[PDB]
Amino acid sequence: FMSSRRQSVLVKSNEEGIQRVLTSDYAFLMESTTIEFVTQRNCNLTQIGG
Amino acid sequence: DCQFELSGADGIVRSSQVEQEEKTKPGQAVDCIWTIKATPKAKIYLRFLDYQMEHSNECKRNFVAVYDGSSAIENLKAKFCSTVANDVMLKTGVGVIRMWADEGSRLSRFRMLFTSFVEPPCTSSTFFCHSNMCINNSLVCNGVQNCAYPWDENHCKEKKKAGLFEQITKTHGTI
Ligand SMILES: *[C@@H]1O[C@H](CO)[C@@H](O)[C@H](O)[C@H]1NC(C)=O
Numbered sequence: 512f513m514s515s516r517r518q519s520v521l522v523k524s525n526e527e528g529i530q531r532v533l534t535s536d537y538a539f540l541m542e543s544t545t546i547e548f549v550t551q552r553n554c555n556l557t558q559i560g561g
Numbered sequence: 562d563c564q565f566e567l568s569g570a571d572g573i574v575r576s577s578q579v580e581q582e583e584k585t586k587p588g589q590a591v592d593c594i595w596t597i598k599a600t601p602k603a604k605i606y607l608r609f610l611d612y613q614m615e616h617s618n619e620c621k622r623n624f625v626a627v628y629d630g631s632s633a634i635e636n637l638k639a640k641f642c643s644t645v646a647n648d649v650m651l652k653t654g655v656g657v658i659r660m661w662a663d664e665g666s667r668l669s670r671f672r673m674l675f676t677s678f679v680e681p682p683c684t685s686s687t688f689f690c691h692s693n694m695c696i697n698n699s700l701v702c703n704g705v706q707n708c709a710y711p712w713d714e715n716h717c718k719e720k721k722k723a724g725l726f727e728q729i730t731k732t733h734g735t736i
């Protein structure tokens with residue numbers, strides 16, 4: 512899925528990933544020690560799965 | 562001698578334009594030129610609506626090339642002759658999309674959508690999609706994607722919200 516769409520889904524930083532989860536329908540794949548920080552400050556976001 | 566000089570905002574590029582406008586006849590090799598001259602002070606984002614080759618995975622008898630700037634072999638952005646065409650993003654406001662096709666590979670067809678855009682900090686008369694887009698505000702609710710993921714096409718449907726007032730009709734509003 513990602514290699515077909517590298518100009519669209521592969522963001523350039525962790526901040527462009529969090530904003531596209533918010534402003535769009537998107538399922539950014541971030542490492543689990545950043546998700547524990549973001550999903551406590553922001554309350555819109557969650558950690559899907561293990 | 563096609564030379565489909567297209568310009569302005571969002572237009573359509575159709576491979577059937579050579580058949581609708583009698584530039585070639587069925588039964589010969591075609592070689593068209595689709596110049597896509599931008600709005601003043603802009604850049605061009607090609608995206609592929611339809612793309613289907615008669616002889617896939619073979620560049621010697623059909624392909625679609627997306628020459629940007631002017632036509633020269635140096636600035637060849639992408640040369641598609643396989644099954645899928647990925648959406649390129651040109652650097653100038655001018656591109657020289659062609660299509661080669663052999664007599665046998667005549668049924669090969671494509672359909673694109675070129676869109677003018679500027680730098681990130683948009684203003685009035687410009688809508689902002691992310692990743693370097695300043696598409697026109699006419700392109701919002703155009704019914705087409707003029708960006709990435711359909712961001713210009715959202716919150717653009719408003720009919721009614723009701724209960725039994727929704728069904729005052731040939732449903733139970735008659736009974
Ligand atoms: C999360 O979404 C709610 C619902 O609209 C919104 O009011 C809030 O500002 C958002 N952000 C948070 C809690 O940081």
Ligand SMILES: *[C@@H]1O[C@H](CO)[C@@H](O)[C@H](O)[C@H]1NC(C)=O
Nearest residue numbers: 569570600685686697698699
């Ligand atoms: C782009 O600008 C206006 C918005 O101000 C838009 O309504 C119009 O359709 C477009 N005009 C041209 C010449 O592309």
